[PDB]
Amino acid sequence: KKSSTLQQLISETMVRWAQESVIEDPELVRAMFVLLHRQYDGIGGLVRALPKTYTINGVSVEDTINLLASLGQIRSLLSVRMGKEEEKLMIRGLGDIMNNKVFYQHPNLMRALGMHETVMEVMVNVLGGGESKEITFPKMVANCCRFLCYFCRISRQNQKAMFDHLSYLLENSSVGLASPAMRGSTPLDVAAASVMDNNELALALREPDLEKVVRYLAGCGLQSCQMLVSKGYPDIGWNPVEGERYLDFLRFAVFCNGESVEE
Amino acid sequence: LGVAQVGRMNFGKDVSTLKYFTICGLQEGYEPFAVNTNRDITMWLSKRLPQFLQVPSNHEHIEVTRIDGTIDSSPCLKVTQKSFGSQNSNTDIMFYRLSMPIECAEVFSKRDDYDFLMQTSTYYYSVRIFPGQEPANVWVGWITSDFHQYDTGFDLDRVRTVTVTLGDEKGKVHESIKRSNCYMVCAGESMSPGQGRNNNGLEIGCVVDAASGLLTFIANGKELSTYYQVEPSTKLFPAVFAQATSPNVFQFELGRIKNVMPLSAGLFKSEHKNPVPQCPPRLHVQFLSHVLWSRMPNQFLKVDVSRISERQGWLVQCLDPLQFMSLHIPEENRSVDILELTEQEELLKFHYHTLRLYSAVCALGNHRVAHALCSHVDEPQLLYAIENKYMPGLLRAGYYDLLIDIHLSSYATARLMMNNEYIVPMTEETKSITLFPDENKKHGLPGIGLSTSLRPRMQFSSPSFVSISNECYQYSPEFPLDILKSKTIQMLTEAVKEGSLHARDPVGGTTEFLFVPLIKLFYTLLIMGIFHNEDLKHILQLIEPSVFKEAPKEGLLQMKLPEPVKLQMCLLLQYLCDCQVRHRIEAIVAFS
Amino acid sequence: LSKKAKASTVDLPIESVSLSLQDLIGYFHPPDEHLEHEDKQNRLRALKNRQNLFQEEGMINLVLECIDRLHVYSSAAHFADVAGREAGESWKSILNSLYELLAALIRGNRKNCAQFSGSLDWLISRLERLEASSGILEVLHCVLVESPEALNIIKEGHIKSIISLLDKHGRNHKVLDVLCSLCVCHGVAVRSNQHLICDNLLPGRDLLLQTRLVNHVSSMRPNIFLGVSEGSAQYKKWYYELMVDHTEPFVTAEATHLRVGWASTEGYSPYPGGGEEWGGNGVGDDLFSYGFDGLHLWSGCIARTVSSPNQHLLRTDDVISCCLDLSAPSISFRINGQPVQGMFENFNIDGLFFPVVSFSAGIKVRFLLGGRHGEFKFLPPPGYAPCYEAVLPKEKLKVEHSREYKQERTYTRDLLGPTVSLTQAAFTPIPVDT
Amino acid sequence: GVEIETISPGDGRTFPKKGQTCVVHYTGMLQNGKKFDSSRDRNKPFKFRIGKQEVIKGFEEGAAQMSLGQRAKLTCTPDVAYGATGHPGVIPPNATLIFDVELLNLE
Amino acid sequence: QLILLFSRTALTEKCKLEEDFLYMAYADIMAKSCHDEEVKSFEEKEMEKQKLLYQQARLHDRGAAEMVLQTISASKGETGPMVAATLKLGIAILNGGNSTVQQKMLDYLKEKKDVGFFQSLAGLMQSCSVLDLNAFERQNKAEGLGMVTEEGSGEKVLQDDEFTCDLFRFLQLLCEGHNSDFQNYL
């Protein structure tokens, strides 16, 4: 009989092409074999699609459309070099996303869309391209950290999802530590909010992660603050401003829900 | 064809038209030249009208030497006769010109001083006739782009000229304008004393006032009586017409005189305020030549001529529109049909890279740059480039990519980025969705159906450059999407019909050039989702008729496609599979 | 040598440097394409290791130092004046070899391209020099493709210098490729670079080849050939009219073309002179033809606005009467019987003149040639004769294409060679001197 | 400072007024003769409201002095069209614009 | 062609072995095909052995052993799903002490003088996990306070038992049958 089905037709076409010619293009070979695997693994398509499937009521359709448009703008800003106009657009998109009610009402959709990962890599771009050469675009780092702290506070599962990015955040836990008016807007603040008042996550905290913070605090206790002495502050031997903020994260790591995590 | 000779060439596109092919040519196995072709062969003929082209390095008569400009010497371009004093030398007047023109002002206003040098619009170049070369055989001055007069006997009296005399109502001529393509003087008449060249090379100096259009000539430091007045916006090319009486003929000196700017400033915009004379590599000597081909158009205007009556005279009637895509060379003030670039390789390559730069400057949602580019490349130009069958393959691909990037890429990328997410509202339309269209468990055609999953909103902005608003810059420029759909469908149908015959004349010259741009535009439209119902049915019939028959012409999948075409058919099949997955997800949500 | 020491006493290893540069380029030659995958991978690994070792030993700075100390001399003649004549001969070759070596050292190496950012500003400053432009451009392209830090450091001045390279050196596709690489690298677009390139290149419309759609324009002429010569049996004054039965102002996005007037031939050849057979050119687009579109007088592709009562573009039911005076060169027009306050004068009369109309699609016009070939709507000006009076006694007047090729089947198309000169157009009676 | 050539006459009676929309087809050309904008190319009539500062002032009064059904040539000096800054990417600085404008309808 | 694509991808120069979904899918497909699994007859046992040998030949005739060695070598001692799939495919093609596969694997290594293969093997062994009292006690405390377990297996303790077992089973199959040459080569 004839193929009568798209899956059968695709399988026959790929097999026939491959056995007809020795394909010189590795991209063509890869595409054909991916398509063949998709035809023979139709279950896997559902397995990958259903976790990304969300249903909403009719009343929330307009708000979901607006939030999706904002998320699309933010996602499309990933393919452009970060500048002043890009910073403004990303900030306004984030602001619209906070102001949207769906962000609060449906944390599961918000997590399924991978908004936290998008804002994470947006912050990663600037951190990599402008931590060592002084913090360029500080407003982006502050806004991204504020968004990520609100994301953690929305739901416990969002906090657990952000807990998986702890190692990178603790690596970049020296971005805006000495600068004021950025309290609650630094990667250390996001790291603290990823573990704040969660016994399971506090227990899941490892020893090397705490060792990293202890080393940072020892460095702050030994060496003065370069940016403060550049602005002209008197040169004392140690760094109270950064030391206090590291001590705050250690406090949040060791104390949970009125009790002390002994481990 | 010789003088008064009439002939006809038959390429045997229609084999029946060949008179003697059957008796001789057919049995021996010879094939008609145009046997496996779908469209008429483009015929190139010898150009009657000579054009200015750069002197070849292998030219057997003329050699051009670019003498560098030292501190004490101006940059020089020396034209010499290679084969002089030997047999076969051409003792005919040779017309020379410089590549770039001086452009007069749009509106004519009614120790060197630096302020004067900066505020002046007067430019100067000089020509040195070497000793031993008769100045009566040498002419110096300016010409326009309209100059195409190749006569072995040239004199200033025979130059083409016209005097437009605009008059008032009662008849007074309030202005009279002389127009010509040759504003030049003879060095022989400038040599009044005589022996002005033998002791030292005769030195004609050409002075042009771009602000007033006044052309004055100075010879050996004294100002000649002959002068010219040109109209505003006239483009004047430095030109020397000389008949060689010496191995060394003349020299293009690019120097400057007191209170006058060198030619380089008026030629080049970057050097507008640079009093030091310059001879950039762009400036080169060109000569009038007859070795050039001309491309006969594939189609001509259909015009009917007949005698209505003795009283009514002869009727001339043209009613069917016909257009061609014209490529303009800026510095030479010339225009050629873009279809000619099948034989000018350097222009074709430069224009393909220009199209690539156009596609790159507006890449990744640069909507303001796309709006700006809509001025340079208009939608009728894009449509003509997309549909034309005689277009070069490189330009075809470039224009397809330009159309996609300017008008479709942003929304296509947004939909591709939101593709793997299924946010479906729970409405009556969603609840009505089922896995199978009817009781028979037979899959419906992919794409066709009712999909309620949320999708990005498609918005476009009108590209108008007379408004002063700024909200229009966001959103991609608007395009006639329905016309694009219909033309893409008909092109795909024609390509499917023609490619099965394996013609030796595919659009663009290769099967890849024929299919890859068309299939790419088709895939972009499909991803955007502009196609709806019956259009998608025609699409599925074209792709694979037997499988997608709705409840022997072969489709694309079994047409022996190249690897690049296969790579895009894989993308199309991938999108169809994604559509099926989305339909399954929506049916599951409906059951839930 | 720069310290003005004697050339003879100082040693300059010209031949050794040239041979080592050739050997070094061979050392850093990239793997060839026809090789197998494993061999190509091994060669690529060896090349990468060589580049890394050279960069760690800082040979790029040494090459830059040699290039800088060679650029102090502006020409091979200058270098042969300072150093030896052999050095002057080899100066250009050594510069080219050094630039090729730099390109080979930094090609495909992300770390080397990132370290060359500090020197990129130094590199672009010599882009204008003709002896190093190609090498500098190749190095710039190699750095821009690999390193994003290069795009970060590139600024408006560097972009304007790159564009001035096109402006001064002419059309070069490599500069366009460099500009393309300046916009997007590794899938990330630099919007500032895009905006700068657009705003500094596109609006000029003087370097890139401009493109437009032009309506096809055809010209139609009668058989009559009108010329003036000394002692010739030809009348100097002629008159004809054009009837505009219908015209559509916009059949397409471009305005409809409709021009009427007189045109002349080059010499005595019957073929119209000065114009191309096909294209968008019509009456008045060259210095051999003279036109009137209802609002302007056209000659040499230049239009001047001419006044007229109720002046307008040629519309339906318009009468255009064209007068040609060959005794004193003059072409005058009268629209709808009213004089047009403008005329062509003092043109070249060494040729044959004929009536001509140029048009695009969307017209319907009628020639009124006088007599039984059209009835004049208005009386001819005194002295002027109808154009039907110029037909030779045996020939028959007809209106045909001005050019020899028209729309027809290809195999039925009559290809035409050069036509004979129409010397018998002007009958000059020359008696035999006796 | 708008130079008005008439190509085709209009009724000469129905001029645009305050608070009216003008429906026009226009073709924009630089002084050198190069087209930069055309509503006929897009095949859509252009609409603007008199006195709302929606278009450049040269084009504004150029259409205002016109009549219904009139085809006119509008020459806008740089002081009434984009100034010395120009339009980025389309109109160069200090450019004089020529417009072929037809007043199709007033509504 | 697919096995050659995988081999070329493994032989291409990368700093890290990127995860390839096509590879994880097709390596699993090939591994399952090569094994396809109360007293039974001797003829039945021989038929099973011959069918297993034919299924393994279906792959190692097309270059599967070289590809699975190349992937392990390119892994550079980094534990991952790619390495786990490669080890499973190697075990599938090496089950039963397949002498032809052992000879092909030894000959390829001897010809190419591959040091990265053994370096990656040592790195993978060093990266293999063990029992963790600290993690087990933290999990027990988390259950004592009664929080819901995200995973009940406590996989943080003994992170990759299957990966460690597959890694050592691959090396055991490499020496099955008293293969003295490869025993000395290791």
Author numbering:
A (entry chain A): 2053 to 2315
B (entry chain A): 1207 to 1316, 1414 to 1854, 1889 to 1929
C (entry chain A): 436 to 869
D (entry chain E): 2 to 108
E (entry chain A): 3666 to 3702, 3710 to 3858
How does the study describe this entry?
Structurally, RyR2 is a 2.3 MDa homotetramer consisting of two functional regions: a massive cytoplasmic region, also known as the cytoplasmic shell, which comprises several regulatory domains (NTDs, NSol, SPRYs, RYs, JSol, and BSol domains) and the stabilizing subunit calstabin-2, and an activation core and pore region, which comprises the Ca2+ binding site and the transmembrane domains. Dysregulation of Ca2+ handling, characterized by aberrant SR Ca2+ leak, is a pivotal pathophysiological mechanism in a spectrum of cardiac disorders, including heart failure (HF), atrial fibrillation, catecholaminergic polymorphic ventricular tachycardia (CPVT), and other arrhythmogenic disorders. Here, we solved the cryogenic electron microscopy structures of ryanodine receptor 2 variants linked either to heart failure or inherited sudden cardiac death.
We chose the CPVT-related RyR2-R420Q and RyR2-R420W mutants because they are among the most frequent mutations reported in CPVT patients. Moreover, by analyzing two different mutations at the same residue, we were able to determine whether the identity of the mutant residue differentially affects the local and global structures. Recombinant human isoforms of the PKA-phosphorylated CPVT-linked RyR2-R420Q and RyR2-R420W channels were expressed in HEK-293 cells and purified as previously described. Calculation of RMSD normalized projections showed that the RyR2-R420Q had more pronounced conformational changes compared to the RyR2-R420W, but smaller than that of another CPVT mutant channel that we previously reported, the RyR2-R2474S. However, the mutant channels in the primed state revealed that the NTD-B is rotated relative to the NSol (2-4°). In the mutant channels, the NTD-B domain rotates and separates itself from the CSol and the NTD-A- domains, weakening the inter-domain interaction and promoting the primed state. In RyR2-R420Q, mutation of R420 to the smaller residue Q420 results in the loss of both interactions made by R420 in WT RyR2.
